[PDB]
Amino acid sequence: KTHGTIIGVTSGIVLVLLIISILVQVKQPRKKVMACKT
Amino acid sequence: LNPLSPDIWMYVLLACLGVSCVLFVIARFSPYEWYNPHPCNPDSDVVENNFTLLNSFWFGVGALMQQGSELMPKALSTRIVGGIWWFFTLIIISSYTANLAAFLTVERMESPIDSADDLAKQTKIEYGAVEDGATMTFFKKSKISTYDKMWAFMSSRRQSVLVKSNEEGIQRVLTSDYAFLMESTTIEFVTQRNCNLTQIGGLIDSKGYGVGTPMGSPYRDKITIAILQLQEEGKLHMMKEKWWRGNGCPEEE
Amino acid sequence: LNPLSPDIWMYVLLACLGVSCVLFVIARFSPYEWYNPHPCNPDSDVVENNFTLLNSFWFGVGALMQQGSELMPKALSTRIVGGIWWFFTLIIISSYTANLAAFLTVERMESPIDSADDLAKQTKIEYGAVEDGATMTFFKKSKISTYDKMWAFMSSRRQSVLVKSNEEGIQRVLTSDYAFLMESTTIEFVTQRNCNLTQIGGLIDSKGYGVGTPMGSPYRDKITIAILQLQEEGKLHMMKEKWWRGNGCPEEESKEASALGVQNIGGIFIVLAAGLVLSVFVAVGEFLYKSKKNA
Amino acid sequence: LIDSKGYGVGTPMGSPYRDKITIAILQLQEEGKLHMMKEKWWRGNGCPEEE
Ligand SMILES: *[C@@H]1O[C@H](CO)[C@@H](O)[C@H](O)[C@H]1NC(C)=O
Ligand SMILES: *[C@@H]1O[C@H](CO)[C@@H](O)[C@H](O)[C@H]1NC(C)=O
Ligand SMILES: *[C@@H]1O[C@H](CO)[C@@H](O)[C@H](O)[C@H]1NC(C)=O
Numbered sequence: 140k141t142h143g144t145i146i147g148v149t150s151g152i153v154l155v156l157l158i159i160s161i162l163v164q165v166k167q168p169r170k171k172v173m174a175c176k177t
Numbered sequence: 178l179n180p181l182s183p184d185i186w187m188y189v190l191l192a193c194l195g196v197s198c199v200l201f202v203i204a205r206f207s208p209y210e211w212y213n214p215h216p217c218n219p220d221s222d223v224v225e226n227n228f229t230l231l232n233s234f235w236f237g238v239g240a241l242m243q244q245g246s247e248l249m250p251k252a253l254s255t256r257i258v259g260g261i262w263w264f265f266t267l268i269i270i271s272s273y274t275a276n277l278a279a280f281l282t283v284e285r286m287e288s289p290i291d292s293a294d295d296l297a298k299q300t301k302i303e304y305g306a307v308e309d310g311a312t313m314t315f316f317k318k319s320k321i322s323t324y325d326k327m328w329a330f331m332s333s334r335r336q337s338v339l340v341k342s343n344e345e346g347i348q349r350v351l352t353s354d355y356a357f358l359m360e361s362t363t364i365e366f367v368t369q370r371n372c373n374l375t376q377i378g379g380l381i382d383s384k385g386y387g388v389g390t391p392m393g394s395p396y397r398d399k400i401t402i403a404i405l406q407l408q409e410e411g412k413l414h415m416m417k418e419k420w421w422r423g424n425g426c427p428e429e430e
Numbered sequence: 431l432n433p434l435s436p437d438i439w440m441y442v443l444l445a446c447l448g449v450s451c452v453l454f455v456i457a458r459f460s461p462y463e464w465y466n467p468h469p470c471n472p473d474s475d476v477v478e479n480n481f482t483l484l485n486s487f488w489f490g491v492g493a494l495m496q497q498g499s500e501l502m503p504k505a506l507s508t509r510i511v512g513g514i515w516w517f518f519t520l521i522i523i524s525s526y527t528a529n530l531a532a533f534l535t536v537e538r539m540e541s542p543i544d545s546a547d548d549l550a551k552q553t554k555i556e557y558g559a560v561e562d563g564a565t566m567t568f569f570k571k572s573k574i575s576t577y578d579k580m581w582a583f584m585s586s587r588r589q590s591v592l593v594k595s596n597e598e599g600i601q602r603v604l605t606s607d608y609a610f611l612m613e614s615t616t617i618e619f620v621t622q623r624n625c626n627l628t629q630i631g632g633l634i635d636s637k638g639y640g641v642g643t644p645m646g647s648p649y650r651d652k653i654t655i656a657i658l659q660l661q662e663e664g665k666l667h668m669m670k671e672k673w674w675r676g677n678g679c680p681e682e683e684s685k686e687a688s689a690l691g692v693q694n695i696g697g698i699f700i701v702l703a704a705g706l707v708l709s710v711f712v713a714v715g716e717f718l719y720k721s722k723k724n725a
Numbered sequence: 726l727i728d729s730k731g732y733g734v735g736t737p738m739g740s741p742y743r744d745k746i747t748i749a750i751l752q753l754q755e756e757g758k759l760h761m762m763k764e765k766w767w768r769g770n771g772c773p774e775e776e
Pocket of ligand 2: 351371373
C-alpha cells in the first residue's frame with residue numbers, strides 16, 4: 140500500500156487533493172467550536 | 178469492485194471528502210441559513226445553523242450512498258452545491274451499473290467451442306494426439322474433409338505440438354490450449370477423476386473391444402453368447418462404475 | 431450526455447424551468463397551500479406556503495435526483511404536477527442508464543484484433559502481401575484450410591491486394607485499411623522504426639536463413655561449427671539487437687482491464703470543481719450583498 | 726445412450742459368409758463410407774436459422 144499510494148500518474152495530484160481535504164477538515168472544527176461558543 | 182477501476186475509487190474518496198467539507202464551509206458562513214428553533218417561536222434571537230460535521234459528512238455519505246439524508250439546504254450556494262453532489266453521485270452510480278451489466282451480458286453471451294468441425298475452422302486452439310496411437314493414423318487415412326484438414330493441420334505442426342506420451346499432452350492441455358485427441362475410455366476415466374477437465378463433442382470413431390482367438394477356438398461362439406448375456410445383464414456397467422466412477426465419483430467436483 | 435440527443439439535453443433544462451415556474455404559479459393562487467406559522471398557537475397568520483421563487487426551482491432540481499426534499503405541498507392541484515414531474519424523472523433516469531449500458535456493451539463486444547491471426551472470415555479489410563514474393567508461394571498449395579481462404583481472396587482481388595514491393599506495401603497500408611503479409615524479420619525491423627505503425631499477430635510459418643556454399647565443399651561443414659559456436663555463445667542475440675534495436679515504441683495498455691477508468695469518466699470531477707468554486711464566489715457575493723442591504 | 730444394441734446381419738449356422746462379411750464390414754467401416762452414407766440417408770432438412 141506504500142507503492143499503491145506512491146505509484147500513480149502524478150501522485151502529486153493525489154497529495155494536493157489530500158492536502159486540500161485535510162486542511163479544510165482542520166478548518167471545520169474551528170467554526171464548530173466557535174458556533175458552540177456562540 | 179472489478180467493474181470500476183481502482184483509479185476512480187480514490188477519486189470517489191477525495192471527491193466525497195471535498196464535497197462534504199466545501200458544502201459545510203459554504204453553509205456555515207452564510208447569512209440566511211440561521212433559523213429560529215422553537216415551533217411556536219415568537220420571533221426569538223436564537224437563530225443558528227444546525228449543520229455539524231456529522232450532519233454534512235453523512236449527508237454526503239447518504240447521497241453518495243444513493244439515499245436522501247435529512248437537513249435540506251436553504252441558501253443558494255449550499256443548495257446548488259448539494260445539487261451538484263446529487264448529480265455527481267447519480268451519474269457515477271448509473272455508469273457503474275452500466276458497466277457491470279456490460280460485463281455480465283458480455284460473459285453470458287460467450288460460446289465455448291463444442292464441435293470437432295468447429296475446431297477445424299479454428300486455428301489458435303491447437304489440436305493434438307499421441308501420434309501413431311492409431312488416432313492420428315485415422316486422420317491420415319480419413320476421408321471426411323473435416324478430418325482431412327485436421328490431419329493437414331497435424332502434418333502442418335509436423336510434431337511441433339504433437340506429443341508421444343499421453344500424460345504429457347494431458348499436462349499440455351492443463352497448461353495451454355491443446356486438444357490431444359485420444360480414445361473415449363481414457364477420456365471418461367481421467368475426466369471423472371480430474372479437475373478442470375471435460376469431455377467435448379461426440380465420438381468421431383467406432384472402434385470395438387473384443388477377444389482375440391485363432392480361427393479354431395471353441396470358445397468363440399460360446400463367449401459371444403456369454404458376452405451378450407453379461408451386456409444384457411449389464412454387469413459391465415457396474416464394472417465400469419467400479420473402475421471409472423467408483424474412483425471418479427469420490428474424486429468428482 | 432452522449433447516450434442522449436443534445437436537443438433533449440436543452441429541452442429538459444428549459445422544461446425544468448417551465449415546470450418550476452408553473453409550479454410557483456399554481457402555488458401562489460392556492461388557498462389550501464397556506465400553512466399556519468406557530469401552528470400550536472391559534473393566533474397567527476397563514477403566510478406559510480412552503481414555496482418561494484427559490485423553492486420552486488429548488489424542488490424542480492432536487493425532486494429529479496432520487497433524494498428529494500421535504501418541501502412537499504399539501505394541495506391536490508399541486509401533487510398532480512409533482513406526480514407528472516416524478517414520472518418524467520423516472521422515464522429519463524430509466525432511459526439514461528439503459529442507453530449507457532447499450533453503449534458500453536457494444537464497446538465490449540467490439541473485438542479489435544481483426545482475429546489477430548486470420549483476417550479470413552472478415553472479408554473487408556483487404557489484406558495484402560508483397561506481389562509474387564515468398565508469401566503467396568507459401569499460400570499456394572498451403573492446405574491448412576484457413577490460410578487457404580486467405581490465398582483464395584488474395585487471388586480474387588489480385589489487383590489491389592498484391593502490391594509492388596515492401597515499401598509500396600507499407601505505403602498502401604498507411605494509405606487505407608490494408609493488412610500486410612510478409613516476412614517477420616522485415617516486419618519487426620520496420621515496425622521497430624515506424625513506432626506507431628503496429629505489429630499484428632504472432633507467427634504463421636518458419637523458414638531458414640543459413641549460408642550457401644559450393645557443392646560438397648569442406649568449407650560448409652566447418653563453418654557450420656562456427657555458426658553453432660556463435661549461437662551457443664550468444665553473440666548472435668546482441669548482434670541481432672544491435673542492428674534491430676532502433677527506436678522503442680512507447681507502451682500501450684493491452685493487458686490492463688477495459689473496466690471503467692478516468693479516461694472515460696473524468697470530466698465530471700472538473701465539472702464539480704468549477705461549479706463549487708463558482709458557488710463559493712457567488713456565496714461571498716451574496717454575503718456581501720446581504721451586508722450591503724443591512725449596511 | 727440408455728442402452729447399447731447392435732444391428733448385425735442374420736444367417737443360419739455354418740454359413741461361409743459370416744467371416745467374409747465381417748471382414749468386408751470392417752474394411753468399409755475403415756472407409757468411412759458407412760459414415761457419409763449414414764449421414765445422407767439420415768440427413769433430412771437440417772437446422773434452420775434461429776438466433
Ligand atoms: C488460464 O489461461 C492462462 C493463459 O496463459 C494459463 O496460463 C493458465 O494456466 C490458465 N488457468 C488458470 C487457472 O489461470
Ligand atoms: C485446476 O485449476 C486450479 C486453478 O484454477 C488448480 O488449483 C487445480 O490444481 C487444477 N486441477 C487440476 C489441474 O486437476
Ligand atoms: C505516427 O505519428 C506521426 C507523427 O509525426 C504521424 O505523422 C503518423 O501518421 C502516425 N502514424 C503512423 C502509422 O506513422
